[PDB]
């Protein structure tokens, strides 16, 4: 058959010293299918922390492709092996995970949790079924685990458009960075994130762990409910298990490994407007002017490939987008506290009168095939691709960006087409098993050759690295170079948005779902994709509001701005062959816009604190319900609702001509952020029909949470100049708590050493006769220097009113309390 598997030749635990396991595996018997088997395997298991188990399987007699440490820094491997069935067990006293190596034929291994004596990863084979074996050929690695089909709820393995957040049973997820529109369901998209979250509904409900395979090669992942299997066409097995035990802790352990999410500037949480096909400077000025007249907040104006001189990077169309007019335009944006972001492609047009091409050829920075720079095909025409694995190409990139930034102020960079995208598929090299692999991954849902519409697998990078191995790293690498370029040309916290991503990208860039469509499906699709990229360590995520491709309708756009105003990254964008869809064009949507974007701007400090938490602990801004309610199994399969932070839930309408929604409400009291009187109270989790007017969206806050809000404004700059309103939602079960992070909105290292930031924590508890509200302040300096003042406190969740020495609403006015000063407020019931 396919493979016969491996036997344990020798296995030992390194005594006394830091406990790790080393083992040598020998091929049982050779098989011709899918290429020759690797004869000897070096197998190690080791704890990187108490809550992280590393399993590394390599060729004992060959250094195989591994993702470079310079690209993704991580602890080095343990030492390798020397030159009833038997078991070798590895465990640590402060670890909840136990690794077991089974000396069967073929061999197996399991990771089980001490806390529940439950198996989390089970690679024990079914002797008669080679689909369950570990197989290790040069271009085919097979790793398989069994799962308790009903108890195991899986999430992740992006990037894919799915109607559901939780992974459906019986499917093949292909991970291979490709220029494929996100309006296509199931197909492999722009990014690859070989990570999944496993939430166990039983025996101990809510029990969570994570599984990451640190491999950049193309792969099919097969999920059949009771089994999951990796089919990888290269590299090694570098497997990481994250103990949990909560969903929160898993993402903490995961991002600790791949990198904490990069902080975002304050202005990034404002609304963005973009469009492919803005004709000239006069049109973008007009769009900004009309957003003002509609009194709809517009923070950042974007320019697509239109601004370039015939689609070449680091140039300006001397006719439609002349330099002096653009300089004026950006100056005026800044004067009104607004920002500007242009787009970049990786391809460099082969124009002999083009400065970027000339310089790129001098530093020898382009990806090569058969000894010559690979000829690509994108917008400007024939292009060469910069090899972002070459440090000289990374210097060249910084140089070009510096040059452009000197003549034209930019507030951020949009990097696109970085799969890399190619419009003309190259012919495969004769006799190459790289351009023609033995196992075909399910690219584009039809076993399409990996070389399709991209750079051939036989192209070479710096250090003799093939495109075959480094393909899923391309967008990741450009994001590093681009962020480097931004940091060295400006002292402010950079902003960048990338299409193609890999595990770890969130440490460098923001992401958007890419090319969605103006269809009701895509509106709903935006939510699982949004929650997935939270797991992937990229909390700054959003979809093109009102849909990129195809023309939108008034009702679709209206319902989309209602939802899209709560994306971490909120932006309107569309193709040029569709109708315009700026929010002012329809009155019903502009009125919706002012409402929803109004609430968002009030929630700016909240969003920013969540961004702070993300960089600090990996915890996503937009998160699944089961993050806050892991003991509620009904929340596991919700794909239509989500949370902003811990206690704010959004429940949008996703179907046309509707005026109501059947949204799920976990146990507790919920209150509308649009009407403090409108509340939802359930003693057990249940669906509830909510009135959803054409201009309204249900956004509720759960009890036990304190949120610091400011005032509405046209810009984020102006919003910070407004007083603070404290929203306190009480609970008869627990003291309410809240958190506010304050900085200048542009410090390079967020919350670092020194004092250009302030952290404030809020606390509230009801007694029989008295209510106490108090804060704690760390690094009081910065907040104090900002004159932030809290003049109002609204109290929800109580059945009795309160005041200074169903449910009711209590308000405390004329407080004038300095945010940067700790306080204890005492109220009395009536
Ligand atoms: C604006 C954006 O423009 C570009 O993207 C465009 C495409 O150029 C455009 O063509 C269009 O592409 C769509 C298709 O219309 C749509 O149909 C879908 O394609 C799917 C198919 O639906 C699906 O069937 C599948 O095809 C497979 C089959 O499944 C498989 O069986 C097999 O079929 C045959 C095979 O081909 C034969 O060789 C033989 O073997 O027989 C078999 C059958 O037996 O293979 C085919 C595939 O070959 O999968 C298809 C996808 O490959 O979806 C695509 C999109 O992927 O629309 C898109 C989206 O607009 C650019 O590529 C894009 O980058 C660009 N967007 C950026 C540009 C700008 C401007 O600067 C920015 O503004 C944007 O934000 C950027 O995102
Ligand atoms: C190399 O870059 C030049 C500068 O952008 C290109 O010339 C410009 O082409 C524009 C249309 O793409 C046109 O509006 C500009 O007037 C023109 N500017 C100048 C100074 O020539 C050039 O394009 C080539 O030459 C022109 C005359 C056309 O025939 C194009 O089709 C050519 O490609 C670029 N050359 C190449 C080979 O890409
Ligand atoms: C607020 O909500 C309550 C409860 O649904 C409702 O009776 C009241 O009319 C609402 N007020 C406004 C101004 O919509
Ligand atoms: C509330 O509690 C405080 C402190 O315990 C006490 O001094 C005060 O008299 C109480 N007020 C009422 C109305 O009971």
UniProtKB/TrEMBL annotation:
Stored InterPro entries: Gal_mutarotase_sf_dom (IPR011013), GH (IPR017853), Glyco_hydro_31_AS (IPR030458), Glyco_hydro_31_C (IPR048395), Glyco_hydro_31_CS (IPR030459), Glyco_hydro_31_N_dom (IPR025887), Glyco_hydro_31_TIM (IPR000322), Glyco_hydro_b (IPR013780)
Domain Glycoside hydrolase family 31 TIM barrel: 261-610
CDD domains: GH31_MGAM_SI_GAA, GH31_N
Keywords for this protein: Glycoprotein, Glycosidase, Hydrolase, Signal
Domain Glycosyl hydrolase family 31 C-terminal: 618-707
Gene3D superfamilies (UniProt xref): Glycosidases, glycosyl hydrolase (family 31), Golgi alpha-mannosidase II
GO terms assigned for molecular function: alpha-1,4-glucosidase activity; carbohydrate binding
Ranges for domain Glycoside hydrolase family 31 N-terminal: 43-220
Keyword Cell membrane applies: no
GO biological process, one term: carbohydrate metabolic process
SS bond list: 546-557
Listed Pro residues bias regions: 73-83
Record-listed E.C. numbers: 3.2.1.20
Chain spans, region Disordered: 67-88
Catalytic activity: Hydrolysis of terminal, non-reducing (1->4)-linked alpha-D-glucose residues with release of alpha-D-glucose
Glycosylation sites: 675, 770
Family: Belongs to the glycosyl hydrolase 31 family.
Protein name: Alpha-glucosidase
